[PDB]
Write an enzyme that holds these catalytic residues in place. Structure first.
Site, PDB file in Angstrom:
ATOM      1  N   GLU A  83       0.840  -1.185   0.000  1.00 22.20           N
ATOM      2  CA  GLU A  83       0.000   0.000   0.000  1.00 22.20           C
ATOM      3  C   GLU A  83       0.881   1.242   0.000  1.00 22.20           C
ATOM      4  OE1 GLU A  83      -2.883  -2.198   3.222  1.00 22.20           O
ATOM      5  OE2 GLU A  83      -1.668  -0.528   3.965  1.00 22.20           O
ATOM      6  N   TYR A 202       1.992   6.412  13.805  1.00 23.10           N
ATOM      7  CA  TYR A 202       1.065   6.129  12.713  1.00 23.10           C
ATOM      8  C   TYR A 202      -0.154   7.042  12.766  1.00 23.10           C
ATOM      9  CZ  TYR A 202       2.891   2.084  10.173  1.00 23.10           C
ATOM     10  OH  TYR A 202       3.616   1.255   9.346  1.00 23.10           O
ATOM     11  N   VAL A 251      27.828 -10.662   4.715  1.00 20.40           N
ATOM     12  CA  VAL A 251      28.618  -9.858   5.638  1.00 20.40           C
ATOM     13  C   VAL A 251      28.370 -10.358   7.054  1.00 20.40           C
ATOM     14  CG1 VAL A 251      29.044  -7.544   6.518  1.00 20.40           C
ATOM     15  CG2 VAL A 251      28.566  -7.888   4.086  1.00 20.40           C
TER      16      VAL A 251
HETATM   17  C1  LIG Z   1       4.664  -8.702   4.318  1.00 18.94           C
HETATM   18  C2  LIG Z   1       5.123  -7.318   3.942  1.00 18.94           C
HETATM   19  C3  LIG Z   1       4.193  -6.285   3.859  1.00 18.94           C
HETATM   20  C4  LIG Z   1       4.585  -4.990   3.514  1.00 18.94           C
HETATM   21  N1  LIG Z   1       3.620  -3.995   3.447  1.00 18.94           N
HETATM   22  C5  LIG Z   1       4.004  -2.787   3.121  1.00 18.94           C
HETATM   23  C6  LIG Z   1       2.996  -1.744   3.049  1.00 18.94           C
HETATM   24  O1  LIG Z   1       1.794  -1.884   3.268  1.00 18.94           O
HETATM   25  N2  LIG Z   1       3.500  -0.505   2.698  1.00 18.94           N
HETATM   26  C7  LIG Z   1       4.825  -0.210   2.426  1.00 18.94           C
HETATM   27  O2  LIG Z   1       5.124   0.952   2.124  1.00 18.94           O
HETATM   28  N3  LIG Z   1       5.766  -1.198   2.497  1.00 18.94           N
HETATM   29  C8  LIG Z   1       5.366  -2.415   2.834  1.00 18.94           C
HETATM   30  N4  LIG Z   1       6.311  -3.414   2.910  1.00 18.94           N
HETATM   31  C9  LIG Z   1       7.711  -3.078   2.598  1.00 18.94           C
HETATM   32  C10 LIG Z   1       8.599  -2.947   3.831  1.00 18.94           C
HETATM   33  O3  LIG Z   1       8.718  -1.578   4.217  1.00 18.94           O
HETATM   34  C11 LIG Z   1       9.988  -3.500   3.505  1.00 18.94           C
HETATM   35  O4  LIG Z   1      10.792  -3.452   4.678  1.00 18.94           O
HETATM   36  C12 LIG Z   1      10.704  -2.755   2.376  1.00 18.94           C
HETATM   37  O5  LIG Z   1      10.967  -3.646   1.291  1.00 18.94           O
HETATM   38  C13 LIG Z   1      11.977  -2.075   2.837  1.00 18.94           C
HETATM   39  O6  LIG Z   1      13.114  -2.870   2.440  1.00 18.94           O
HETATM   40  P1  LIG Z   1      14.496  -2.760   3.195  1.00 18.94           P
HETATM   41  O7  LIG Z   1      15.660  -2.779   2.200  1.00 18.94           O
HETATM   42  O8  LIG Z   1      14.520  -1.584   4.104  1.00 18.94           O
HETATM   43  O9  LIG Z   1      14.552  -4.102   4.048  1.00 18.94           O
HETATM   44  P2  LIG Z   1      14.695  -5.570   3.467  1.00 18.94           P
HETATM   45  O10 LIG Z   1      13.843  -5.723   2.263  1.00 18.94           O
HETATM   46  O11 LIG Z   1      14.381  -6.550   4.602  1.00 18.94           O
HETATM   47  O12 LIG Z   1      16.229  -5.684   3.104  1.00 18.94           O
HETATM   48  C14 LIG Z   1      17.003  -6.841   3.485  1.00 18.94           C
HETATM   49  C15 LIG Z   1      17.875  -7.271   2.332  1.00 18.94           C
HETATM   50  O13 LIG Z   1      19.264  -7.267   2.745  1.00 18.94           O
HETATM   51  C16 LIG Z   1      19.816  -8.560   2.583  1.00 18.94           C
HETATM   52  N5  LIG Z   1      20.768  -8.804   3.667  1.00 18.94           N
HETATM   53  C17 LIG Z   1      20.525  -8.734   5.013  1.00 18.94           C
HETATM   54  N6  LIG Z   1      21.570  -9.006   5.758  1.00 18.94           N
HETATM   55  C18 LIG Z   1      22.571  -9.277   4.841  1.00 18.94           C
HETATM   56  C19 LIG Z   1      23.923  -9.636   4.982  1.00 18.94           C
HETATM   57  N7  LIG Z   1      24.530  -9.792   6.166  1.00 18.94           N
HETATM   58  N8  LIG Z   1      24.647  -9.834   3.859  1.00 18.94           N
HETATM   59  C20 LIG Z   1      24.046  -9.680   2.674  1.00 18.94           C
HETATM   60  N9  LIG Z   1      22.781  -9.346   2.414  1.00 18.94           N
HETATM   61  C21 LIG Z   1      22.089  -9.156   3.542  1.00 18.94           C
HETATM   62  C22 LIG Z   1      18.630  -9.522   2.556  1.00 18.94           C
HETATM   63  O14 LIG Z   1      18.945 -10.719   1.854  1.00 18.94           O
HETATM   64  C23 LIG Z   1      17.597  -8.678   1.806  1.00 18.94           C
HETATM   65  O15 LIG Z   1      17.778  -8.744   0.396  1.00 18.94           O
HETATM   66  C24 LIG Z   1       5.939  -4.735   3.246  1.00 18.94           C
HETATM   67  C25 LIG Z   1       6.870  -5.765   3.333  1.00 18.94           C
HETATM   68  C26 LIG Z   1       6.475  -7.055   3.672  1.00 18.94           C
HETATM   69  C27 LIG Z   1       7.508  -8.149   3.750  1.00 18.94           C
END
Ligand SMILES: Cc1cc2nc3c(=O)[nH]c(=O)nc-3n(C[C@H](O)[C@H](O)[C@H](O)COP(=O)(O)OP(=O)(O)OC[C@H]3O[C@@H](n4cnc5c(N)ncnc54)[C@H](O)[C@@H]3O)c2cc1C
Ligand SMILES: Cc1cc2nc3c(=O)[nH]c(=O)nc-3n(C[C@H](O)[C@H](O)[C@H](O)COP(=O)(O)OP(=O)(O)OC[C@H]3O[C@@H](n4cnc5c(N)ncnc54)[C@H](O)[C@@H]3O)c2cc1C
Lengths: 592, 592
Positions: A83, A202, A251
C-alpha cells in the site's frame, strides 16, 4: 549534516556536486529497497562513480522484502503487498528519476501517477463476517467518547514517555471493540502487544487520510508486484550507471573504531563463495548497513506442505548483533528479534487459481471482475469473526507480467498464529497451502462440499513463514534503533526500517527511502534539503477534519450533547469566537 | 476545473496531454510576467503548438513591470526591484523548466538556488535616520500588547467582512509607531489608506518569515535585473518553441457573449500599425487578459528634468473598463485606477554613478563593498525620519550585464509624494533626477557642500512617474477583481495581479505565475494539481514562532507578566497541559 525542508523550491532544486566525492566509494550491505535507494541517491545527487558503488547481497536476486516471483518447484508468491500514498515525499523524490520499464519517456512516478488516476483504488467491501457477509457497520468507526479521548491522549503523550509501552497499555475495551481498531490493526498489521510509540507515530503520520481509512480511497498501487514495478527499474538504472552488484556475499561483521572523537568503519568481513575474505576501508569508503530484516530466515511450503517454523537468526540479525557489541549507539537488535510471542503474525500465503467458481465467489464479495485487470478488492478484505484474524487482498491482476490471463493470485495473512481455525481447526503455522486456502474459502461462503476439492486440486497456494515479519512494531525504547548517521560517525550509516529518524513510520517503503536519502546526504554533505515528514499533524485544517471524522461525522454540538461540562465549555468558547475566522474555519470543516 | 495540492507527488508528476488541445489556440493580451508564464504553461503542460500561441504586446519589448534597460537619451533604469522567497510555489514550478542563459545544462531555478546559496541575502543596516545613523532599535519590532492584539484581530477577521476597509480602520497609534510598521510598510509599499484585506493576506501569507523580516534574511534575488534574469530566458524558451510574438498591437476591446449559460470571447478588436483590425475567435481560441497594469502610462524624466505627472488611462485600464461594461463578473477597474490620493507613491528613481565618494558613503552605511559583485544593502534601506518616507536599495552590482564594472545603480522610492523634502524642500513629483539624488545623498550623511555637485555632475539619476504603481493595494471589495476563470467562461481567463484567487498576495511575481497557471489548467482541464498557497498560517509550529517573534522574543510568562487576567489563564492552561506533547512543543518554540 543536513536540513529538512518542504515546498517546490527545494524539491525541484538540484544539489551541487558534493566536495571530494570523486575520491569516495560506497558499500551497501543488503540489496533491499533501502540499499538500492541509497545507491540511486549516490548516483543522482552525490554524483559518485557507479563503479565505486558496491551492493553486497547474500541471496541470488535483489529486491529484499519487495519480492515477487514464480518460485520454481512451487508457484506464484508475493511475500506481501505494498500500500502506498501520495505523501511518500522521499520515495517520490526518488522515483521521478527512475525510468519506467513499461512506458517510453516516462518515469516510474509517471506510470504510477497516471495508472492510479486511470484506475483509482477504492474498496467496495472492507470487512466480512459469518462466511461472506459484509459487516453491517462497514464504514463507521464506532468509537465511543472514551476511545476517541484515548486516541487523543496517546497523541498528546510525549514520545520520550512511551519507552517499552504496549498498545494495550494506552487503550481500553471500547477502542478494541471499535471498527476503527479492525481497520487499523489489519491494514497496518498491528498487534495488541506492539509499540504504542509506533502506533502514535502512525496516528500522527497519516492523520490526513482518516477520511479514506475505511474504504482505502487514499491507497495507491503499482501495476505489477513490487519486484517488477519498483526493484527492476531501479536495478536497470543502477546497472546503466555501472553500479557493482556482488551476489552471494554474506557480511558477518564490520570492524569499526569507536574512539573518543570518531566512529570509523575499518573492515568488512565477508563470506564470498564459501571463502572468508576482508574488505579494507578508508575514511572515504562509506558503508550503508541495512540493520535487521523482517524477511530474514523465511521458510517456504507448498500446496501440500506447511512452511517449517523457525527461530533462526540469519546474517542480518547476527550482523546487527555483532555491530551492537561495538557500541550501544548502534542499537539493540534483541529488542526486535527475540521474545516474539507465539501469537504474532508469521505466515503469509499466495493462492493462485484459474477456477471460475472461486473467482466468481470473489466477484460476489468484492463486486468487481477479478480478471478485468483493474482494481479487485481495493486492498485487504478482513474476516472479522475469523479465529486467525485473517485478511486477504487481490491487487490488479495479474500481479506478474508473464502470468496467464485467466489466473488470479490472492494474498492472505493472519494476525493470530497459535489459534485453531474455524474450518481447519489447527493453527495456521501447522497448515499446508491448501489448508490455508480451505480456511480462507470457508469464510468466502463457499459450500463446504466443494471447499476441500477446490483448495487441493483447483488452487496452488504457497505459504511463507517469516519469524520476524512483525519485528518492526516490537516494543522499543529510544536508543534501540541506531541513528541514520550515529554521533561522530565518519563513514558509517544505518538505513532501513530499523534505523532511527524523526516522526516517520516504519513498515513503509518511504521509511527505507528516507533513511537511504538522509544517510547519503549526511555522509556526503549534499547541499540540498531533505523533505520533512508531511506536516499534517500540525495543520489546523487536517486536525479539524480528524475531529470530524473520528466522531463519525458529527459537529461540536452533537459531540457535546450528552454532558453539561462539555456543553458549557462549548457554548462559552463559541460565543468567544462568534463571527470570526475561527468560526468560519470550523464551519468549513463541518465541525459547526 | 482544477484542484489544489501540496507535496512532492503532484510536484514531480507530469500531466497527460489535455483533451482536444491539438485543435486549440491561445491569445495573450500583454507580455508581462503573467502572459509569458501562461504561454510557458501552455507549451509545457497543455502541450499546445507554439505557432498557435499569440502574445500581443503594445510596447516595443516584452517584460512588463520586470523591465531593466539602458534607456537611450537617459541612463540605466529599473522601475523596481524583485524581492523573492523560497515559497513562490507556482513560480518555482515554472522556472525549473526554463533554461538559464548563464549556466549550461541548468534551469533558471538552478542558477537562482545556487546563487542565493553562494551569496545569501541579509541586511547589515535596515533603518537609518538623522542623515546616515542606524536606528538604535533596528531589529526589534517594538509592538505594544495592543498592537500585537490588533494584528491578531485583523487575522481573525473574516475576509468577507473587510470590503473597502482601510488599514487605518483596523490599527491605532501603537502599531503605526512600531518598528514593525516601518519594516512592513516600506518593504511591501503599503500606504495607511490601503486595503486592510490585502494587509491581512500579507500577514497570513508570509507568517513563516517573520524571523527574517527585519534583516531581510528570507529574501532571495536574481543575479541581474528581472528583464535579463527572468524575461529573457522565458522569451528564449518560448521562441525556441515557435511562440508568436506580435509587437506594437494595442487591444481596445474583446467582444464577449455573456449569455444565461456561457461566457464566450468572440472577437479581439486591435490596433496594429495604426490599422484597426479584428481577430475572430472560436470556442477553441483561449484569451488570457492581463487586466490592469501598475506600470501603465509611466512617464520618464532625466537628471535635469522631472518625470511629468499624468492621470492618463492607457490601453490596459481602458480595456479593463471596456470588459467591465460587458459583465460585472469581470470586475470594477475604477476601484483601482481612480481616486488615487495625491500622497500615494508615484516616483521611482535609478541613480547611476562611478564616483568613489558616493560609493564609499554607501559602504560606510551598508558595511559591504558595493562594487564587489555580491550583496550590497541586502534590500531597501529606509530613511525613517525622511519627509518623503524614502527608501533605497543596491542589489548585486552590476544589475546589467553590460554595465561598466566601476559603476553602481541605486533604486530609490518614496511613500509620500505631496510633501516638501528635507533638503530639496519640494515634493518628489516636482524633482528632477539630480534633485531626488540630492535629497537622497543628504540622508546618507554627505557633506552639504558636495551634495549638489555630486548629484548633478557625478551621478545620472533617471526618475519615473507611475500613476498606478500603488493600484494593487487600493481598498477593494469581493467582486472588484474577476475570477481567473469567471463562471461559465469557456475561453476567457483573467491573469495577473488584478485577478482573483484565494489567499495569495498581489504585488508579487508569484501571483502572476499562479493566475497564469490556474487559468491554463482550468481552460485546458489539465489533469495535474495546482500547488496551494503555502500552509504556514495553519501550521501550529509556524504560529507559535509568530507569537514568539511578534512579542520580541518573550515566552508566555513574560508576555502575561503584567496582568492578573493574563496570569491566571496562563497558569490554569499550563497546568492543564503539564508534561504533555503540547508543553514540549511550546518549549521547543521558545514560548515556555
Ligand atoms: C509482508 C510485507 C508487507 C509490507 N507492506 C508494506 C505496506 O503496506 N506498505 C509499504 O510501504 N511497504 C510495505 N512493505 C515493505 C517494507 O517496508 C519493507 O521493509 C521494504 O521492502 C523495505 O526494504 P528494506 O531494504 O529496508 O529491508 P529488506 O527488504 O528486509 O532488506 C534486506 C535485504 O538485505 C539482505 N541482507 C541482510 N543481511 C545481509 C547480509 N549480512 N549480507 C548480505 N545481504 C544481507 C537480505 O537478503 C535482503 O535482500 C511490506 C513488506 C512485507 C515483507
Ligand atoms: C516598482 C515595482 C516593484 C515590484 N516589487 C516586487 C517585489 O518586491 N516582489 C515581487 O515578487 N514582484 C515585484 N514586482 C513585480 C510585480 O508583481 C509585477 O506586477 C510583475 O511584473 C507581474 O507582471 P504582470 O504581467 O502580471 O503585469 P504587468 O507587468 O503590468 O503586465 C502589463 C503588460 O501588458 C501590456 N499591456 C497592457 N495592456 C495592453 C493592451 N491593451 N495591449 C497590449 N499590451 C498591453 C503592457 O504593455 C505590459 O507589457 C514589482 C513591480 C514593480 C513595477
Amino acid at each position: 549534516h543536513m536540513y529538512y525542508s518542504y515546498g517546490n523550491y527545494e524539491a525541484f532544486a538540484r544539489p551541487k556536486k558534493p566536495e571530494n566525492v570523486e575520491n569516495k566509494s560506497a558499500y551497501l550491505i543488503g540489496s533491499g529497497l533501502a540499499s538500492l535507494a541509497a545507491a540511486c541517491f549516490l548516483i543522482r545527487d552525490g554524483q559518485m562513480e557507479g563503479s565505486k558503488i558496491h551492493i553486497l547481497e547474500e541471496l541470488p536476486k535483489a529486491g529484499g522484502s519487495l519480492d515477487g516471483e514464480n518460485m520454481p518447484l512451487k508457484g506464484y508468491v508475493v511475500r506481501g503487498g505494498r500500500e502506498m500514498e501520495n505523501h511518500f515525499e522521499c520515495l517520490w523524490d526518488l522515483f521521478r528519476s527512475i525510468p519506467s520499464l513499461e512506458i517510453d519517456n516516462a518515469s516510474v512516478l509517471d506510470e504510477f501517477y497516471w495508472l492510479n488516476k486511470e484506475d483509482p483504488n477504492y474498496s467496495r467491501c472492507r470487512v466480512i463476517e459469518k462466511q461472506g457477509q459484509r459487516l453491517a457497520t462497514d464504514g463507521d468507526f464506532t468509537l465511543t467518547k472514551t476511545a476517541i479521548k484515548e486516541i487523543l491522549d496517546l497523541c498528546l503523550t510525549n514520545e520520550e514517555d512511551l519507552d517499552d509501552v504496549k498498545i494495550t497499555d494506552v487503550f481500553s475495551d471500547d477502542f478494541f471493540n471499535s471498527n476503527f481498531w479492525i481497520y487499523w490493526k489489519t491494514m497496518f498489521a498491528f498487534e495488541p502487544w506492539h509499540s504504542a510509540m509506533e502506533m502514535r507515530r502512525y496516528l500522527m503520520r497519516f492523520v490526513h487520510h482518516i477520511s479514506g481509512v475505511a474504504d482505502f480511497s487514499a491507497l495507491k498501487f503499482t501495476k505489477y508486484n513490487q519486484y517488477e514495478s519498483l526493484v527492476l527499474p531501479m536495478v536497470e538504472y543502477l546497472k546503466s550507471h555501472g553500479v557493482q552488484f556482488e551476489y552471494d556475499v554474506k557480511v558477518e561483521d564490520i570492524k569499526i573504531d569507536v574512539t573518543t572523537s570518531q566512529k570509523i568503519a575499518r573492515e568488512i568481513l565477508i563470506d564470498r563463495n564459501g571463502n572468508a575474505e576482508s574488505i579494507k576501508l578508508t575514511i572515504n569508503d562509506l558503508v550503508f548497513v541495512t540493520n535487521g530484516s523482517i524477511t530474514e530466515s523465511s521458510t517456504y511450503g507448498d500446496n501440500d506442505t506447511p512452511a517449517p517454523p523457525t527461530d533462526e537468526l540469519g546474517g542480518s540479525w547476527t550482523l546487527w548483533k555483532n555491530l551492537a557489541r561495538q557500541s550501544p549507539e548502534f542499537g539493540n537488535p534483541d529488542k526486535f528479534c527475540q521474545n516474539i510471542p507465539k501469537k504474532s503474525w508469521f505466515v503469509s500465503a499466495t493462492s493462485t487459481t484459474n477456477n471460475k467458481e472461486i473467482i466468481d465467489t470473489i466477484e460476489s464479495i468484492c463486486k468487481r471482475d477479478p480478471l478485468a485487470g483493474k482494481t479487485v478488492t481495493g486492498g485487504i478484505i478482513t474476516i472479522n469473526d475469523s479465529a486467525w484474524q485473517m485478511s486477504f487482498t487481490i491487487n490488479r491482476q495479474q500481479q506478474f507480467k508473464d502470468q496467464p490471463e485467466n489466473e488470479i493470485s490472492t494474498w492472505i495473512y493472519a494476525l493470530y498464529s497459535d489459534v485453531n481455525g474455524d474450518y481447519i481447526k489447527k493453527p495456521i503455522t501447522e497448515c499446508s497451502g491448501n489448508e490455508i486456502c480451505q480456511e480462507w474459502l470457508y469464510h468466502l461462503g463457499v459450500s463446504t462440499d466443494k471447499i476441500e476439492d477446490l483448495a487441493k486440486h483447483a488452487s496452488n497456494t504457497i505459504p511463507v513463514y517469516m519469524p520476524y515479519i512483525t519485528s518492526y512494531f516490537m516494543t522499543r525504547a529510544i536508543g534501540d534503533r541506531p541513528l541514520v548517521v550515529p554521533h561522530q560517525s565518519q563513514n558509517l550509516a544505518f538505513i532501513g526500517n530499523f534505523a532511527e529518524t524523526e516522526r516517520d513510520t516504519v513498515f513503509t517503503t518511504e521509511y527505507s527511502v528516507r533513511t537511504a536519502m538522509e544517510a547519503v546526504y549526511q555522509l556526503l554533505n549534499i547541499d540540498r534539503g531533505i523533505p520533512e515528514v508531511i506536516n499534517s499533524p500540525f495543520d489546523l485544517r487536517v486536525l479539524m477534519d480528524a475531529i470530524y471524522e473520528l466522531n463519525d461525522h458529527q459537529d461540536l454540538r452533537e459531540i457535546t450533547k450528552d454532558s453539561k461540562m462539555q456543553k458549557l465549555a462549548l457554548a462559552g468558547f463559541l460565543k468567544k469566537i462568534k463571527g470570526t475566522y475561527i468560526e468560519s474555519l470550523l464551519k468549513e470543516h463541518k465541525l459547526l
